[model samples]
Structure formats: C-alpha cells, structure tokens
Target: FCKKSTTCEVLKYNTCLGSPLPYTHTSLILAEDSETQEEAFEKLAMWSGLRNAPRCWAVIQPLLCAVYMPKCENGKVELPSQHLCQATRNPCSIVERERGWPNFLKCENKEQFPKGC
Candidate 1:
C-alpha cells in the first residue's frame, strides 16, 4: 500500500547497488522505512547467483530492486516492461536450475510498458 509519505527518494542500499535505468534516479520504492529498504536490497543480493557467465542483463541489480520497490511518479507506480521480464527469464532458466522467476517479476503483458504509463 503506497502512502503519501512514501515519496520518491534516492535509495541508500540500491545506490550501494546502478546501470543506467534510463532515469536520473533509482527506482522510487514505496518503502516506509530504512529497514524495509535495507531488507529489499538484502533480498536482491541473492541474485548474484542468477548472474552467470552468459548473463542476460548488464546490470540486473537495479531491475531486481525495481520490482520489489519500483519507480513512482507523481501519482503512479511503474513496473518493469514485459519484454524486459521475458528477456530476464530466458537467460536464467539455465542458471536457476528450473527454480524459475518469482511471481512478482513475471511478464503478463503482450507488449512492453508504455513510456508514459
């Protein structure tokens, strides 16, 4: 549940994590406190195993964070593009040992997310 207090702020743990998410700032997570933010990145750190030799993303670290805590504009939260999700899954099947992607990060759209959604 996003709240008015959960405004867009430059992340500490994630800044401890970047790679050109195409935005000036990292994902505007709807986190309520520093603990949530720290835990979010703590969860993200497990993916270091998902990154193998034939890694799909140049910098998936941010993408990982984006889903748990995503980009929020003036009044809306932005999710990862569908194509990006599909692309993310394709490469990990080999490394993930069939464990597969989490539901929160799955692709459900026929097309990528629109620029201004």
Candidate 2:
C-alpha cells in the first residue's frame, strides 16, 4: 500500500502534463522491492520532469485538487447536488447504499456515481 502514494503522484503528474506513460509504467515493476517511499517519489518526480518543467503551477494544481476532494466512505458513494452543482460541477453528497444492494435508494434526484460504494 505504500506504493499507492507514488502511483497517485505519477498519475496526477502525467495526467496534468498530458504526458505519456514512461516512468509511470515502472510502478508495478518497482512495487515489490522498492527500498523506500522517498526513493520512489524521487525517481517519479525526476521522470516527471519536475526539474525542467516551467509550468510548476500547472504541475502542482491537480495534486492539490486531489488532496481536497471529499473522501467517499465504504458502503457509500458520492452524488451531485442538483441545484448548486457547478464549478467542478456540483457539491457531492454521499449516498448510503449501492443501486442493487439492500436499503439502496436513488440519490434523491441526484445522479449516482458508477462506483465508490
């Protein structure tokens, strides 16, 4: 699970930069035997061109967004608030059950997420 941080960092970096999966592909290869989280992040940061990329703000923005997104809980999923859904398009509400599960209900006129429940 320690590898999840490096994986998420690489994902956000690559997605923000619109870069191809070069170093990101190495994640699975290095997962089992990687010495430390710091080392993994260092390698991923280097491959992501953090040293040379001039758009530092762009590179870091997605990471910040990820940090702030509301966490969905087990047995629940995020639904959009209907009336005020804007910006990132609607504040999310957590529904308590899955569509086909017991006690499940529609998101009170809100759209349901495909997963996270």
Instruction: Give the winner by TM-score.
Output: 1
For all candidates in order, the CA lDDT equals 0.49, 0.28
Off by over 4 Å in 1: 1-10, 14-35, 59-62, 95-98, 109-117
Write candidate 1's Cα lDDT for 1-117 as tens digits.
222223455545434344434333334343222246557666656656655634665435545655655655564566555455556666555645656544455455322232322
Give the clashing pairs for model 2: 85-90, 86-89, 86-90
Weakest ten-residue segment in model 1 by summed lDDT: 108-117
Per-residue lDDT of 24-114 in model 2, one digit per residue for the tens?
A: 3222222222344445445345334333433543433332222222122332223323222222112111111212211112223223222
